[PDB]
């Protein structure tokens, strides 16, 4: 169901940074976000669920909970790579989160390559 999703870590060996962030969220929100991540791959999201943020960064938003839970990610070839997961109060995704996302994309691309290897 989660297909080609990846989860930000700083190195092939490093701390599972995205998962530690994700895991702190409430059960109901974690379950809802997994469903959105699965649907993202199928192509059947409603318009409230996916927003372009800046550059290559995209946002999954849990619409049924006033977009209070979100995942920033980017497409690394055919693999969406989850960069940060967070609770948010305002509709405007905060600057700090977007900077973290941009920073983690650069970190990822530097450690693992700008695009996936042709064979995994």
Numbering used by the authors: 8 to 127
What does the paper say about this structure?
In addition, alanine substitution of residue K95 of HigBTAC, which possibly corresponds to the active site residue R81 of E. coli RelE29, fully inhibited toxicity in vivo in M. smegmatis. Note that the K95A substitution that leads to the inactive toxin was used as non-toxic HigBTAC control for further in vivo and in vitro analysis. In parallel, the crystal structure of isolated monomeric HigBTAC[K95A] was obtained at a 1.9 Å resolution and used to compare possible conformational changes that may occur upon association with the ribosome. Notably, these regions include most of the proposed catalytic residues of HigBTAC (i.e., E66, R68, N73, K95, F93, Q98, and K99), suggesting that such differences could have some functional significance. In support of this, the structure of HigBTAC clearly differs from the alpha-fold models of HigB2 and HigB3 in particular in the two loops between β2-β3 and β4-α3, which contain most of the catalytic residues.
Here, we focus on the deleterious toxin of the atypical tripartite toxin-antitoxin-chaperone (TAC) system of Mycobacterium tuberculosis, whose inhibition requires the concerted action of the antitoxin and its dedicated SecB-like chaperone. In addition, we show that HigBTAC functions as a bona fide RNase that specifically cleaves mRNA after the second nucleotide of A-site codons (mainly CCA codons) during translation. HigBTAC has a similar compact fold as other RelE homologs, with four antiparallel β-strands flanked by three α-helices.
